[PDB]
Design a protein around this nucleic acid. Structure first.
Ligand SMILES: [Mg+2]
Ligand SMILES: [Mg+2]
Ligand SMILES: [Mg+2]
Ligand SMILES: [Mg+2]
Ligand SMILES: [Mg+2]
Ligand SMILES: [Mg+2]
Ligand SMILES: [Mg+2]
Ligand SMILES: [Mg+2]
Ligand SMILES: [Mg+2]
Ligand SMILES: [Mg+2]
Ligand SMILES: [Mg+2]
Ligand SMILES: [Mg+2]
Ligand SMILES: [Mg+2]
Lengths: 159, 204, 137
RNA sequence: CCGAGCGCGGGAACAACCGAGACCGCCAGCUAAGGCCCCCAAGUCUGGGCUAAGUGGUAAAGGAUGUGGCGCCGCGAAGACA
RNA sequence: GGGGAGGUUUGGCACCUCGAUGUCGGCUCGUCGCAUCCUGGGGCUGAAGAAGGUCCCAAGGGUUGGGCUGUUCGCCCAUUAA
RNA sequence: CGGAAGGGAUAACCGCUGAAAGCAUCUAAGCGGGAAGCCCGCCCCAAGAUGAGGCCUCCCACGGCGUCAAGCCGGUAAGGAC
């Protein structure tokens, strides 16, 4: 949590950094301690649900840090002949086996990038956003389970 | 949301560019605004449109005050138009350009206490083999001890027609402002003389 | 012979509703709706206190209720069993949820319907600024 | 037990399930079952836990890291489980 | 080989009705159920595409005309998204 | 000429982030997508919505009894009826 700027609030926590500030809805019955330059959190007891709440925020707060720190970005491969993608200003249009060229809206806080007609990164500041934005792309044209086509994260081939 | 009162004058067919087309002739005379009701003064936007002229003696009612409140010739009829604040003091057939489609609301013809077969277009019964009693009857209407009643809104013979009916998407044909006339796609509720309103359709 | 009361001036009341459990609140509203709280009670005359509530939307409700709770509106027509979840009522007219609560706890008799009138409800707050307003919890 | 106590209270309502055997009167008090937030009389009473399914508001063989409590055995700071 | 659901069939009791509760089909008019024939949505496939199989969600609407027989039922004819 | 389009929540279901359970999981906190269906949207009814609504406009004084509370009687106005 170096160089950060985590500020505690009642039911939430406002983290700041080079990328910017971002809210993160923190659970109610949790102690968001601010030890030294770093940050800690403790649970009110040792029950089943409480265990889930601690570990959850434990990472969820770690996301707010990393998000405004080094930022997030996922890649996207594209297999197939005509299958490709042209970046157009903010949004990106990509023909991928459909009569209508797909126009993809750029949501706020996110700015995907096109280093190649095949590869496509997804700049962002939140794991929830970037994670959704990634699938939103794979959703347009899932991997053909009979050969290589459609978009891919970076995982193994469907074969 | 365009809107204008008028009366069904009759209908015949014209020729578009080279094909025949049945068309009804509406008459949308100058309708003076009588009262622009804003959400402030009421709770919804609209406009009272007068219509035909009137013998000032017949309108001895307080309506005389309602007419003076806007300074206008005493009209015969006046109705509102939801979500529609235009301009000037009078709406005209200029509002509708040929090609635009419109909804026309009117009062269907009164067929009085019509038979069930006449009303819901039932089937009646056999004309030969069966008894000569149920030729035009509804036959059964329900079950046994259960429910033991009759479903409300069940179709049964009774007064029918002569009610508010609204045809839709009638394309506005040639509109002549030279006489306040307005052609449409033919079929239109009401008899030749009834009061009909014309509004903007909902294609999208 | 037991006391025979007479005409009594309507004692109005101002009632909050924030965080208040639906049932727990309606209970007191009804018991106070009729003069059942005052020792001068008389089921005959029915002279309950005029209860006025505010902050209706604020009403809490335990566990699966906003999603689980269902209401029933049956018209005389077939299939007219139209039913609505709790969340929708709060969207449309939310004051309804508490009304159908108190109404359900009021007596079935005619005077009970006369009592339901004594019950006023909104959410703002801001009642029709009349006069009486004895706050209560 | 009803029958013959379809007289009374409870059980929503219900001859025989629970209470209780009505000579009549009272604007008296204790109690029975079952109840004690409102419609509805009486504690939103006290202490201690279990359940978050509306289970409660009542269906099985079988199936499942649902949650809580007791006992046994193995590995573990001479370094365990993943 | 084992456990249920449903209350459409045959059957078993004989509890209201024998000082009467008209019984098969067809017609007319329907309404409701979903365990769905179609159309709409989805998982798996021994799913290449098309087409198909199977299971899940889903009543909103739709579910033809005719030959045989009193038939319900059923076979057949022409067609259908069914 | 209509079935819709379009908005919103949602079914099975696909998915993001993510524990309890260092891994993993769509789930328990949270979030997105997704049915001819659910709510709205279109057409019709509707203030007996006794919870009787709203806006514009027109008429308005007791003249004789009621000490009071509530009434009674003819002429009337706007306007209505025959
Ligand atoms: Mg005869
Ligand atoms: Mg009959
Ligand atoms: Mg005996
Ligand atoms: Mg008894
Ligand atoms: Mg006891
Ligand atoms: Mg016997
Ligand atoms: Mg008999
Ligand atoms: Mg395929
Ligand atoms: Mg399939
Ligand atoms: Mg189903
Ligand atoms: Mg024959
Ligand atoms: Mg839809
Ligand atoms: Mg009206």
């Amino acid at each position: 949590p170096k160089g950060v700027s985590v500020e505690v609030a009642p039911g939430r926590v406002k983290v700041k950094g080079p990328k910017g500030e971002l809210e993160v809805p923190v659970s109610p019955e949790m102690r968001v301690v601010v030890e030294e330059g770093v940050v800690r959190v403790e649970r009110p007891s040792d029950e089943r649900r409480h265990k889930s709440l601690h570990g959850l925020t434990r990472t969820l707060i770690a996301n707010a840090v990393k998000g405004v720190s080094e930022g997030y970005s996922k890649e996207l491969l594209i297999k197939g002949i005509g299958y490709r993608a042209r970046l157009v200003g903010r949004a990106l249009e990509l023909t991928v086996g459909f009569s209508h060229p797909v126009v993809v809206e750029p949501p706020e806080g996110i700015t995907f990038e096109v280093p190649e007609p095949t590869r496509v990164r997804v700049s962002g500041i939140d794991k929830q956003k970037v994670g959704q934005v990634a699938a939103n792309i794979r959703a347009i044209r899932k991997p053909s389970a009979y050969h290589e086509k459609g978009i891919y994260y970076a995982g193994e081939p469907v074969r | 949301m365009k809107g204008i009162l008028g009366v069904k004058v009759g209908m015949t067919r014209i020729f578009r560019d080279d094909r025949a087309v049945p068309v009804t002739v509406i008459l949308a005379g100058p309708c003076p605004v009588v009262q622009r009701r804003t959400p402030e003064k009421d709770g919804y936007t609209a406009v009272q449109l007068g219509f035909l002229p009137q013998n000032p003696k017949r309108v001895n009612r307080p309506l005389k005050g309602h007419f003076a409140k806007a300074g206008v010739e005493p009209v015969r009829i006046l109705r509102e138009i939801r979500d529609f604040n235009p301009e000037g003091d009078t709406v005209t057939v200029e509002i509708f350009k040929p090609g635009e489609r419109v909804d026309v609301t009117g009062t269907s013809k009164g067929r009085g206490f019509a038979g069930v077969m006449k009303r819901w277009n039932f089937a009646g019964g056999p004309d030969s083999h069966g008894a000569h009693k149920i030729h035009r009857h509804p036959g059964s209407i329900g079950n046994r001890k259960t429910p033991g009643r009759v479903y409300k809104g069940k179709k049964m013979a009774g007064h029918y027609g002569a009610e508010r009916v609204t045809v839709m998407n009638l394309e506005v044909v040639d509109v002549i402002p030279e006489e306040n006339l307005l052609l449409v796609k033919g079929a239109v509720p009401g008899p030749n003389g009834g009061l009909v309103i014309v509004r903007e359709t909902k294609k999208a | 012979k037991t006391y025979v009361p007479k005409q009594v001036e309507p004692r109005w009341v101002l009632i909050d509703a924030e965080g208040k459990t639906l049932g727990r609140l309606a209970t007191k509203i009804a018991t106070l709706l009729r003069g059942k709280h005052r020792p001068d009670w008389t089921p005959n005359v029915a002279m309950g206190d005029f209860v006025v509530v505010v902050n209706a939307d604020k009403i809490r409700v335990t566990g699966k209720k906003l999603e689980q709770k269902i209401y029933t509106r049956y018209s005389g027509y077939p299939g007219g069993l139209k039913k609505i979840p709790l969340e929708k009522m709060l969207a449309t007219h939310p004051e309804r949820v508490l009304e159908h609560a108190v109404k359900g706890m009021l007596p079935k008799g005619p005077l009970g319907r006369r009592l339901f009138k004594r019950l006023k409800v909104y959410a703002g707050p801001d009642h029709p600024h009349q006069a009486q307003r004895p706050e209560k919890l």
